[PDB]
Design a binder for this molecule. Structure first.
Ligand SMILES: COc1cccc2[nH]ccc12
Length: 191
């Protein structure tokens, strides 16, 4: 999480798509889904990001429908967006022990207990928190086993990005779970 507003320049694909779904939260507009291999994913939009402006117009107070209409009605030559980076999330760095543990339990991507005297414990990992990213890779909508596998495969250092569940549950509301599994970009970013 950068403490930064940043500008992205985005460009509709052949199909007139940017690969984005937006959600109204607390009178802002937040990214609910970034589609794989999309304009939004290439410019590095992330689940949880706040859209401050689209083409220089302020997003405050907009409904989700308005935000999707706006994106649709724009000329797809160049859309500019002003982004605040994943403001509802935090990143925690942890170290695997010798037996390859960081020291929590999670169910449906939500952390539910911290294991006594673990790295997770020393680092102040909280429960009632949804896992959003692992080492910069979105894991939202993957099965628990697959999150476990990314944790195994990771080096001894592990970075986790988490969001209070009440906020997480509000963002993903009305988005059908299979879309999250299928469409939400789960790739390492490209260079
Ligand atoms: C294509 O028209 C729409 C787009 C988005 C939201 C909508 N609600 C009622 C119609 C409608």
């Amino acid at each position: 999480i950068k403490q930064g507003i940043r500008e992205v320049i985005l460009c509709k694909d052949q199909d007139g798509k940017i690969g984005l779904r937006l959600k109204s939260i607390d009178n802002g507009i937040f990214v609910q889904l970034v589609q794989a291999n999309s304009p939004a994913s290439l410019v590095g939009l992330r689940f949880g990001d706040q859209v401050l402006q689209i083409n220089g117009e302020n997003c405050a107070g907009w409904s989700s429908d308005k935000a999707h209409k706006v994106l649709k009605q724009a000329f797809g030559e160049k859309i500019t967006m002003t982004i605040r980076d994943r403001p509802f999330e935090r990143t925690i760095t942890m170290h695997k022990d010798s037996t390859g543990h960081v020291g929590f339990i999670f169910k449906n991507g939500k952390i539910t207990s911290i294991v006594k005297d673990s790295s997770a414990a020393r680092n102040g990992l909280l429960t009632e928190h949804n896992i959003c990213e692992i080492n910069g890779q979105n894991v939202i909508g993957l099965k628990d086993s697959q999150i476990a596998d990314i944790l195994s495969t990771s080096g001894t250092v592990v970075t986790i990005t988490i969001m209070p569940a009440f906020i997480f549950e509000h963002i993903i509301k009305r988005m059908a779970p299979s879309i999250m599994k299928s469409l939400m970009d789960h790739t390492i970013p490209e260079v």
